[PDB]
Amino acid sequence: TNSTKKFQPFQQFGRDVSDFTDSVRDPKTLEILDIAPCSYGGVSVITPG
Amino acid sequence: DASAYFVGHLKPLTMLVDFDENGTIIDAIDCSQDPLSELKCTT
Ligand SMILES: *[C@@H]1O[C@H](CO)[C@@H](O)[C@H](O)[C@H]1NC(C)=O
């Protein structure tokens, strides 16, 4: 997804507290993006037996 | 005219750094200089 941050010319990657890379700069068109997994939320199955 | 320069030497130390929401370094505390900064390094 489109991001909002911007950093120095000598910086390419940014990481989270858990050292997960969440910000990447596209090398062709100089824009900043954001990554997030599409596995999210909790499910629960109810069975009568 | 007359000018002056200052020269210091580097030492191996342990640093505590903090960044703001733009990644700019705004403060730094070195340990081993006084007990309060040692407490801040520990905590
Ligand atoms: C961070 O960047 C924004 C946009 O350039 C700027 O307005 C702001 O003063 C900067 N600093 C902080 C502490 O938000």
UniProtKB/TrEMBL annotation, chain A:
Name of this chain's protein: Spike protein
Organism: Bat coronavirus BM48-31/BGR/2008
